[PDB]
């Protein structure tokens, strides 16, 4: 998906965790698929 | 960079944590030019703050 | 890990040339690994920091170090289009045919990204056009998938 | 309810995943009256949707 | 913390993960401290 | 786990009396455990579902089952203020002095929550007023911490 969603969260520490995961989930999409595939292959070998 | 071991009950929780962990680790593969482009996008997103109206 | 090792990893990633030289002079581990097993040389290669790559290649840093995914610095310079870094890594003895965990060579990843000139340099250094990944795919196969017909022509001619 | 084992590099990621996992599991201890009170609060929060204005 | 924070996220699947964690993080706060303490003691024993 | 076991756990939690009886009749494991090790009896106790507790107490379900945190159904009925459920659990042979992993008894948790009448019932069944938790604390100590002076008076008189 590509479109934009809003949420509200109570608690600054909750907000800080969600903003850290918002960042990693959004940036994750810019990682080339071949590196995602090697990474998943590694997690499998464990 | 010690290899720590998270005990997880159940598939649903394990898979959720895996997807989060993946997203956290795979950022390392991004060039800073990519990170800076994202950061500017995020900064410009502020120009138009969220507020409760409608 | 070590403290200096983590700092050297961040300095290399963020292109802090002077901080890289100071950290190294203070004993920072050139073989330090981040959470995905990348060394400072990998991160300088990802992030396009030529001067930092060149500095690290004067050390005992392994030009062919593999992260936990099997990626070498050359894989990562190739996928991210850093031509000058691809050149200096190969000059320093980078394995042009290094295979990551899903059987990608640097040529696969340059094909995937559409970096024609890097494909040409990898070929000049004897990149294996016939090497097949986990999913049966050559570089030529990928370049087709990703509409990089220009690279698919270069690879067909090499085959 | 199989006990699965998540390999984690590094303290920072491990601790983040622990806090998330804790939050996921400890919901089981809440009574449905508590869950329903939360759900109504969340529903009323909608009456005033978020929008980009200011 | 008690006050309310807004974020935006790109991607429906990203939004769905964040809404699941928003829920668990917000509800987590309603769990009596003694049960949080037993839970942390258990994670420690492992 | 089993499929019916997970369904029985959800039916008990959500107060679906009829679905609990149908699941049980179809062989659903009364000893099924959720992700924190709670049985259907624990979840019926948390969620205040008296009729479902009473149904489960006619089975071989362990009234003193401990979840992964050491909590018994009585702990959880006590902390959440479910007086009638506390009564039927004790009538069914619930250990009034069961200790969870941090050394809380049901009396500790009723003290913590401020459920006076549950404190009185636990005392009637011989709850141990002197039992100290991980952090040295009696029920009387907790009831002080949480401004439940009314319970602190009842506990002092029992001591």
Numbering used by the authors:
A (entry chain B), E (entry chain B): 351 to 396
B (entry chain A), D (entry chain A): 359 to 412
C (entry chain C), F (entry chain C): 1 to 159
What text comes from the article?
All members of the p53 family form tetramers in their active state through a dedicated oligomerization domain that structurally assembles as a dimer of dimers. In contrast, p63 and p73 form hetero-oligomers of all possible stoichiometries, with the hetero-tetramer built from a p63 dimer and a p73 dimer being thermodynamically more stable than the two homo-tetramers. Here we report the generation and characterization of Designed Ankyrin Repeat Proteins (DARPins) that bind with high affinity and selectivity to the p632/p732 hetero-tetramer. DARPins are small kDa proteins consisting of multiple stacked helical hairpin units in which certain positions can be randomized to select tight binders for a folded target domain.
For a structural understanding of the interaction and the selectivity, we solved the X-ray crystal structures of complexes of both DARPins with the p632/p732 hetero-tetramer stabilized by mutations, thus the same DARPins that were used for the in vitro selection. For the DARPin selection, we used the same p632/p732 hetero-tetramer construct of which we had determined the structure and that is based on rationally designed mutations in the p63 and the p73 ODs that enforce the formation of hetero-tetramers (by inhibiting the formation of homo-tetramers). The combination of an E363K mutation in the p73 OD and a K377E mutation in the p63 OD thus selectively stabilizes the p632/p732 hetero-tetramer. Of these DARPin F11 represents a DARPin with three internal helical repeats and DARPin A2 a DARPin with only two internal helical repeats, always flanked by an N- and C-capping repeat. Titration with the DARPins yielded dissociation constants of KD = 10 nM for DARPin F11 and KD = 17 nM for DARPin A2 and a 2:1 (DARPin : hetero-tetramer) stoichiometry, while a control DARPin did not bind at all. We also measured binding to the two homo-tetrameric ODs of p63 and p73 by ITC but could not detect any binding, demonstrating that the interaction of both DARPins with the hetero-tetramer is not only highly affine but also highly specific. A detailed structural analysis further revealed that both DARPins bound to the hinge region between the first and the second helix of both p63 and p73 ODs. This second helix represents a special feature of both proteins that are not present in p53, and this explains why p63 and p73 interact strongly with each other but both do not interact with the p53 OD. The structures of DARPin F11 with the mutant p632/p732 and the wild-type p632/p732 hetero-tetramers were indistinguishable, displaying the same intermolecular contacts.
